[PDB]
């Protein structure tokens, strides 16, 4: 129809919760009778290339396709479509790759020329482009996108809106969230990340989740993409991703799911329940010195996740469902990298902080008593977690030490300049990590970036050289315990991944892991932190940001040391400690005990989880029998 | 006459070094018989407040009655005035203090109104202001400053310049040098900084020294103002300072002077010879990626005096000229004193590098050969100074922690769980200093920055009680030879003192800078590296900068690490010592050699600025005898 013939566009200018009374409306509702729209899909690209948003967009289509192909469904049927909406939000129109405006003009998305950028001495907030199209793409290559107009092609309501400037995406979402949806009012808003690829089943997979009244929030697996026929997995930093990546959602998502609480929605790929997250949630995520008020920014994603648990009256609940998945990219140079994984370690420390200290917010909600107490203990594990991956990297520097010493202690031949040489190595690769972190940016310095990298690699190949060779000397003769705890804890990772039947990972992509933990320690950990946050008021905001960044440092090497004193004996203790008996030993009881601790409390994790993994799929499992 | 009785004024428009044949004139070049200037001051002021120009001009003027009351004197008579010219370059229209433009007025320095920003559509680099005034100042109380026209004042050739925007001081000696100084060729230029009161002669006796056609620069003492009747004394920060400012006017400036070269030319007070200065000089001070030729924008003032020594077929010298003095103050709160000394000590560093690897030039000059012989003597042991203040952090660390661990093994009573609290008490301050050096500003945390010079200064109390405590046991019963050495530093200190007849500073300020040097070795030091430098080519040379400094850091750390492990055995090596021996004691023979080492070249250091201020002051004796 005409709405499919041609595309209206319009200029918004309001703040984003104006919308409704500022009369401003859409095609949804102008109907003759309203379409009663039941999901909305929110894609935010910021300069994304053309074949990134077409993948995207492929996936979009190709799960519509298959929802209007449905034949026994009460929701879905012949013309599922009409109950469906796009949202593509793009950030800024200078910074947007046109590159990417040739494809969706090429879908009649988008045309330009009647943009004034302010209308009666009044800018336009932001620009709107409304249309329906009826064809669709079929394939998408490495450098062209095939776009097919047949009677198998299946329409699709747009909405492309286009913002003019840099809003960090808390913006982006406020218009899609009390803007939008406050007009529309669906029931389900699923946000994606442009370049995401959903599976080709995977959005009617998590919508049939919302069966289930009491779910609030949910997601699906993270993948990371392989191009043809693999070839990416040769790196060794693609494939280390992808395998945390599996072992994430295996273990933690499963476990954490099991009681009801996910701790991180993939801003790749989740959906939520709008009337849900109404009222208090969207306040508290968008609106927010003291340190909670003024700091909960860095937790954008995650603090909506805490509130729709423990909403007052409420019993929303969140839930993983295995049976959709999401495929995305990775970054390939350790530099964009490292200014990555710096946005995931502030998010979850701060979230973990911020729920913890606010956990007697469950009690009052309106919960079962039981699901009440699962939650207080599942809160309780996750702090725990925080606890242990705080105490990171005194940790795996004090193992390193110990076990080198032990070994060169024991059979003298020529594992001793070892010792001081990987000692020496050790410190000036955390030292320089630091200083770099620091003062510099990563992009500046990626050589040594690099360097770093595989120096802590050649550590952990060192590291496992003398833990089987002390090993098979005891054993061919603390060290049967360690060997009986990382036999178990690879064997308790098998299994898992075996149950949830996705094992390609554990054998393909297992050792680039493994050499890549000491880089996941000592140089993720040192570069989260140093950038914590990255007269007029703002120097004041800024002083006040500055003082909680290098507070936060601080306390962290401190705390650390404290415990490579305690443990190692270093600092002078040990030195008090003999002059005391005047009034030093190489390597006391502590060290035995302590080393057994951290492997001893490393398999505990590793069990708990896997009990975790086994008894969301065992549910799973009888539900579907059931069904 | 006319130009007494009315200000000219003129707008500036070309690159400062362009003025001549831009057809630009001044007064003293227009009258009937053009005036030979023998001598050019300038004053630059930046946003001083009217007391401080008060108080330079003042000294200015004052010095200027002096000279033509002179009678026994070629140069200078009845009208000696009129070969003398005071230009005042300031900063920017914007940023100046207007509170100071209401003195220059009153002085028929200025008058507002007739400075269109730009004219035939090209702005006025800048603003200036032409008149010579009959009126002089007579007193300045704390608020007031009293302006007085009688028989009694003498006219002075002023010439107000103001530029319109923030250039960092290198460019306003520019338009001094290339600029103004080309048009008047005067004999003679001297530079002060508002502020800063000469001595009431000191201007004269500085002036008396290039009656020696060889010297090329010179310069004065400079004194911290003490205010009324010594109270700012009182203040450990100001006093401090006061003991610095007169040990380094006494020992460095007469022993270098001796030879030829002084390091650093005082911008509060210093004289240049033009022609000296002319050509080379000038050229490699103002427009300088490689090393040396990208950074030595640090080094900014010094660069020049290495130069002048150096000049090819010239044999220009610099002298340090006893009897002339500057008094001006220094900063109160430690915040912007550590704003302060982050500069000199880059400067002082970078010229001191620069310098020693360009020392081969001194050769291909025009001095005599024992003159050149001088001069590299002085290189070396000036190079010498900068490599032991390279590792001042590691010796006092180590000085402190040997002292410390052997006193309470000697005596085992109470000094023991005291040599566990200051260890870490050190460690907590200099990691704190880094990281708050790094990412933060001094002004943000003022109370740390007080807490961490207060804890440095109980710390060597603790030590100095120590040393005193074995020096008496020991007594009564390497200790001999340090109780030797650190009297005879004393009384060197003293003697020279006494010797150069300002020892009022030895009894008065000297318990002060006693307990701030902890904080001028491990937080000026720290600070002053960690601040070196404070797409597009500007990234690109950001990127240069943070590499440099960045690497610096580094080296500085790890050298004086290797120094510490190399004595007290940290880092393993005694581990790897133990251990060889097996296919650790506290303390070894190494402790006590390096401890005498450093007090022994310390009482050197002494001895030998001793000699140097006995031979200067004997020569300035002698010559004063036959004169
Ligand atoms: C204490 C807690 C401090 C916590 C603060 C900071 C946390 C980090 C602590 C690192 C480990 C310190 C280990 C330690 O006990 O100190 C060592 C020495 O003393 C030092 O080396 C002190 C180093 C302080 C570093 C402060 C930050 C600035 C680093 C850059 C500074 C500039 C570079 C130069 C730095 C010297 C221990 O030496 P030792 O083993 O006793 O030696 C004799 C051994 N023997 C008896 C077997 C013969
Ligand atoms: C080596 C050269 C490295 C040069 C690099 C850096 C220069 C600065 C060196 C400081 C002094 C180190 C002293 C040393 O030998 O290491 C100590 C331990 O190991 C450490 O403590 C290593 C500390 C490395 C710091 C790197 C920068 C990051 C600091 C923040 C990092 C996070 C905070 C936590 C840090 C652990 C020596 O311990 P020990 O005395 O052998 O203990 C047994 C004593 N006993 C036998 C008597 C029982
Ligand atoms: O100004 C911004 C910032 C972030 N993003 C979104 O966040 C991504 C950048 O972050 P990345 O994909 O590396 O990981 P994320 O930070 O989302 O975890 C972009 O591709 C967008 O999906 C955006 O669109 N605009
Ligand atoms: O933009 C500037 C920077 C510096 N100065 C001069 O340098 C002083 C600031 O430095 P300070 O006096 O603290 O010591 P200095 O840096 O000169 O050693 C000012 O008072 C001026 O004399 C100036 O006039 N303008
Ligand atoms: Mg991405
Ligand atoms: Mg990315
Ligand atoms: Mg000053
Ligand atoms: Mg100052």
């Given at each position: ?5 041609f ?5 918004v200018?309001?703040?984003p ?10 095609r ?10 039941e999901?909305?899909l929110?894609?935010?690209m910021y ?14 289509m190709?799960?519509?396709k298959?929802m ?17 909406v ?6 800024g ?6 590159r990417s ?18 209308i ?5 907030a ?14 998408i ?8 107009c047949?009677?198998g092609?299946?329409?699709?309501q ?7 400037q840099?809003?960090?995406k808390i ?5 899609a969230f009390?803007?939008?949806a ?10 994606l ?32 993409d392989?191009?043809?026929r693999?070839v990416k997995?040769?790196?060794p ?14 273990l933690?998502?499963?476990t954490?799911?099991?009681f ?12 939520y ?16 010195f ?10 954008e ?7 729709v648990?423990?909403k007052?009256?409420?019993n ?27 946005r ?12 913890f200290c ?20 599942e809160?309780?594990?996750?702090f725990?977690?925080t606890?242990?991956?705080?105490f ?5 520097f ?10 060169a202690?024991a ?20 030292l320089?990590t ?13 050589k040594?970036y ?31 315990d360690?060997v ?23 054998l ?22 140093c ?13 006040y ?6 507070l936060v ?5 401190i705390?650390?040391?404290?415990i490579?004193?305690?443990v190692?004996?270093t ?11 005047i ?5 006391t ?8 601790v951290?492997?001893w ?13 086994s008894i969301y ?5 009888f539900?579907?029998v059931?069904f």
């Amino acid at each position: 129809p005409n709405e499919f013939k041609f595309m209206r566009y319009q200029a918004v200018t309001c703040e984003p919760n104006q919308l409704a009374e500022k009369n401003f409306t859409v095609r949804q509702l102008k109907y003759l009778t309203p379409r009663e729209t039941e999901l909305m899909l929110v894609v935010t690209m910021y300069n994304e290339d053309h074949i990134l948003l077409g993948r995207t967009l492929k996936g979009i289509m190709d799960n519509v396709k298959y929802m209007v192909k449905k034949k026994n469904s009460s929701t879905w049927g012949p013309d599922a479509w009409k109950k469906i909406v796009v949202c593509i939000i793009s950030d800024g129109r200078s910074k947007i790759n046109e590159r990417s405006l040739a494809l969706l003009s090429s879908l009649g998305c988008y045309q330009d020329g009647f943009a004034k950028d302010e209308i009666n001495e009044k800018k336009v907030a932001m620009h709107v482009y409304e249309h329906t199209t009826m064809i669709n793409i079929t394939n998408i290559s490495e450098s062209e996108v095939s776009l097919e107009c047949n009677q198998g092609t299946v329409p699709i309501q747009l909405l492309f809106c286009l913002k003019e400037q840099n809003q960090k995406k808390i913006n982006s979402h406020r218009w899609a969230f009390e803007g939008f949806a406050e007009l529309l009012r669906p029931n389900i808003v699923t946000l994606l990340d442009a370049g995401t690829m959903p599976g080709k089943d995977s959005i009617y997979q998590l919508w049939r989740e919302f069966r289930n009244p009491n779910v609030g929030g949910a997601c699906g697996e993270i993948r990371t993409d392989l191009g043809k026929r693999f070839v990416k997995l040769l790196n060794p930093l693609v494939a280390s991703q992808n395998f945390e990546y599996k072992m994430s959602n295996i273990l933690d998502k499963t476990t954490e799911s099991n009681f009801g609480f996910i701790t991180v929605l993939p801003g790749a790929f989740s959906a939520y329940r709008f009337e849900a997250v109404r009222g208090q949630p969207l306040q508290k995520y968008f609106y927010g010195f003291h340190f909670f008020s003024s700091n909960m920014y860095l937790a954008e994603d995650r603090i909506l996740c805490f509130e729709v648990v423990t909403k007052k009256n409420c019993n929303w609940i969140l839930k993983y469902c295995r049976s959709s998945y999401a495929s995305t990219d990775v970054p390939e140079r350790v530099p964009e990298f490292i200014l990555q994984r710096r946005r995931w370690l502030n998010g979850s420390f701060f979230a973990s902080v911020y729920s913890f200290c606010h956990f007697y917010r469950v009690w009052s909600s309106g919960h079962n008593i039981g699901r009440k107490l699962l939650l207080t203990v599942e809160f309780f594990y996750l702090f725990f977690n925080t606890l242990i991956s705080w105490f990171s990297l005194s940790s795996f520097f004090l193992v390193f030490r110990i076990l080198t010493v032990s070994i060169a202690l024991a059979y003298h031949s020529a594992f001793n300049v070892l010792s001081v040489i990987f000692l020496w190595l050790y410190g000036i690769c955390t030292l320089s990590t630091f200083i770099l972190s620091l003062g510099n940016k990563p992009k500046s310095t990626e050589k040594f970036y690099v360097l770093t990298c595989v120096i802590f690699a050649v550590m952990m190949i060192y590291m496992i050289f003398c833990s089987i060779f002390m090993s098979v000397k005891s054993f061919q003769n603390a060290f049967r315990d360690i060997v009986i705890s990382l036999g178990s804890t690879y064997c308790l990772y098998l299994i898992s991944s075996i149950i949830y039947l996705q094992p390609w990972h554990m054998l393909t992509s297992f050792i680039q892991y493994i050499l890549l933990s000491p880089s996941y320690i000592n140089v993720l950990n040192i570069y989260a932190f140093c950038n914590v946050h990255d007269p007029s008021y703002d120097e004041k905001k800024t002083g006040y940001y500055a003082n909680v960044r290098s507070l936060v440092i601080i306390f962290w090497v401190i705390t650390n040391f404290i415990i490579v004193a305690v443990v190692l004996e270093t600092g002078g203790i040990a030195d008090y400690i003999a002059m005391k008996s005047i009034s030093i030993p190489l390597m006391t009881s502590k060290a035995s005990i302590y080393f057994n601790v951290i492997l001893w409390l490393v398999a505990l994790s590793a069990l708990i989880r896997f009990i975790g993994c086994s008894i969301y799929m065992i549910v799973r499992f009888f539900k579907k029998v059931t069904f």
